[PDB]
Every structure is written in structure tokens, then in C-alpha cells.
Amino acid sequence: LGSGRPAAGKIGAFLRKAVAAQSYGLMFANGKLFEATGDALEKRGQYGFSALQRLDGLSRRNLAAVEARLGALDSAERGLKERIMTGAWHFRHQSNAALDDGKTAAIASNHLLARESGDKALLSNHDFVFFGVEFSGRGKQDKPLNHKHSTMDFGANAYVVPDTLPACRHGYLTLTDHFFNRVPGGREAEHQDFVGSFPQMGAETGRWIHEGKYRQNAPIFNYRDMKAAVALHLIEFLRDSKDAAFKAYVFDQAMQSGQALDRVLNSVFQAEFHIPRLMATTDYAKHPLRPMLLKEAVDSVNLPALSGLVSSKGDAVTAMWHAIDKGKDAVAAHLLGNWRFEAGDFASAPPGFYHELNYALSEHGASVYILDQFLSRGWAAVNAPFEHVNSGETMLDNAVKYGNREMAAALIKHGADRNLLSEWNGGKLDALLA
């Protein structure tokens, strides 16, 4: 019971400091945008702590850049800075997948899903969890103010965590979307009624946000400099603004209320917070914002929600076509037993599907599980060629075309005539069988 129990926190504070250094190590090393500005880094098998040291180095540069742009702050501007500096934030992440179990909410990044099975080359920040930043400060169980970030409705469930989580000590924030660094105009903004009351502002919101000489140099700030950045970058816009009504709403009503401050910061910018690798915690809040639809759950694999969304055999057929196209296996397994279809159910083409049955099962990235279980029940013909897309070709034609060795194995296992392929396939089949 000596000095080991408090020092036991080093294990964890050091591991979260090493795991976070890998996600940033992927962003600086593999980021094409960081090479043009020279902010890129070296290449290692396990990126060291120098990746986090350049995060603080990059944050101090962007902070001192906007600090030198304004410098002489007005007296009323100093109070607005401390207002945002002292205001606690709530980070909002939306999606359609059930990411919690009622006790712990685990949200993995876009890169951690790859180890388990354009924009990715420009930034290489897909090893981070995306969050929409709310500046209300009215509690974590409070209703989410904003439903969309950069005109993107991510999902029907909102997972909110306060900035008190230890994982936020290593995160970073961009003023808008790190890729598309253009806060949209008034017509695209979410809360239209608030922006409509300020006319001369709606023409100044449609802008590109940047800092360096390159237009795409989206400003990046660490946790230590988040509040000091969004405050100064707001003052930089308020000083250039000609709107006499909006230049008075930020100094009067916005500093008093937390909701008015969010409407200002969510309209001037589109703040995006990122957490490396994984965001697993028990202190969170889940608010169902809107009802979820059928296609929303099939793509994100939300089987518990999908059980109630299907209330008829037609909705079950419609849900099956979405699993075939997007290539989800478990979604087809639940619909398999709960609803017993027939062969003529999937015979026609549903409205909104620009591919037919046989081609979707043989498309690029299609699942053999969706295909094998479909031919085992005999709900589709084995050698009937397509009559709408790539006509004159069979199931095995696409299987050998893309080179999928496993898809061609099951098609012949169900009796595929090897002599029904066109000339552009011929004898390449034997190189894929074994």
C-alpha cells in the first residue's frame, strides 16, 4: 500500500500516450497534405513519441499565427475569449450501429476496422474517431443541439461525452472538416432560423478556413490550445464582419447563454474533434435523435434495431437486397430465419436498385456466404446469364473477371457450366481453382 497504488496510473497514461502516437504517426507520415506544408514526419514500424511532439509543435505554430493576426484584442473581445476558454464542451458522435451495450460505449475509428476486416491518402487521419463539438455546457444528458456536422447526418443515435474524459488530453480539433475545409453558406447551414435573423453574416460564412499559404492547410490544435483557437478564430471573423446585428449578439446574448454560443460557433465554423484509435468509456450519453430507417441499419449492421424495422415480408425482401449490395453477411442471416421467402420474391428488381439478382450476387466484393446460402436454397438460377448488365455473361464470368478465387469455387460446386463463359475468360479458371 506504498507509493505504488498512485503510481499504478502511469501504466495506462503511458499506454494511451503510445497508442495515440501511432494514430498521429499515421497522419504525419502517410499524409499527402502535410508534405506540401512540410509538417509531415518520418516512417517507423512503431511511431515514437516524436509524433506527439510535432502535434504540440504544430499547435503552437497555428496558435501563434492567429495570435499575431489580431494581437491587439478589444476589451469586449477579451471577455468573449474567457467565455469560450472557461466553457466546457460536449463532443457528439453519430452513427447507425449499436456501439454501446447500456454500460460501456466503444467507438472504433475507421482504421481499426481494417485490422479486423483519396481522402485517406490526403490526411491519413482515419485512425481517429470523429466528433461534433457542442459548446452548450448544459450537461451531458442535455438534448443535442446540433444534429448535422457539415450537412452530414451521420446517424440516428448521438453518443455524447464531455471533455473531462482522459482520452481528450491527446486529441486534436479542426475548425471545420479536416478534409473539406469549407463551412457552407446560409442555405446549407442546419439551424436556418437563427442564421436568417442575421443577413450580413450569411454572405460571409461561405468561406474556406485555412492558415498557411495553401488553401487546404486546415488549422490543427491540440487539447491545450482548442479553446484559445476557436475563440481567436471567432474574433478574427467578428472583426472582419460587417453585420452590426451579429457583432452585437456575440458580445451580449451569446456570453450569457450556452445555447446562443453554440449557435454562433456551429454557424461560423464546423468544429471537428478527433480521438485516436478507440473511444471506450462508461461515462457517456446516448440520445436517439430521429427514427432509423431500413437501409440505415443494414449498412451499419444494427441487427437489434432491424428486428422491429421489418414488419412485413416485403420489408424483409427489401432489407435483403440492401445486404446483397453492400455486402453484409450477418444482416442476411437474421432475415434468413425470421422471414422465409420464396424463389419468386427476389425474381424481379426492386425500385431503386440498378442491378438485377444474378449480377448483384456476383458483383465485385460480393459475399460468398450471401451467394452460397442463396444457391443452396435454390432461390436463383445457377447458369442463367444476365439480361440487363454485362449481358451474355454468367455468374462465373464475374467471379473469374475480378479474380475472386473463393467465389469461383462455390459457383462450380453448385454446377456451373465451365463452357458458358465468353472468350475473355476461357482457361483462366484453372489458375484460380487451386
Binding site: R5, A8, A18, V19
Partner: protein, 64 residues
């Protein structure tokens, strides 16, 4: 900064160098700061440079 090298050694399974990997799993699972069991998996993945079941606290601080 330099005191981090002492931080792992206070609860080393042996004396110097190799530390038990499953020990660091249950340490963060209960003792120390109350961490989440879902996060514990990803912390040990990048930690064990050997990639089997051990801890190299001496080299890990030097490499990073």
C-alpha cells in the same frame, strides 16, 4: 520525464527488464485508474513489441 523509467519497475514481475503482459492487463482492469476493458485490448497490442505475451519496459521508453 526520466521518472517514467521507474514507473514500470515498481511493479515488475521479476527484477529488471521483462514484465508480465497479463499482469499489466489485470492491473489496468482493476487497480490504478479505473480503465475500460474494451480499451485494455488495444493498449497491449501496440505495447508488446514481441507480439506474444511479455512487456519490454526498458526498451519501449528508449524507442519512444
Amino acid at each position: 520525464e526520466e521518472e517514467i523509467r521507474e514507473a514500470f519497475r515498481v511493479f515488475d514481475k521479476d527484477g529488471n527488464g521483462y514484465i508480465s503482459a497479463a499482469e499489466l492487463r489485470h492491473v489496468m482492469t482493476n487497480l490504478g485508474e479505473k480503465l475500460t476493458d474494451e480499451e485494455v485490448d488495444e493498449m497491449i497490442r501496440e505495447a508488446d513489441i514481441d507480439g506474444d505475451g511479455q512487456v519490454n519496459y526498458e526498451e519501449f521508453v528508449q524507442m519512444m
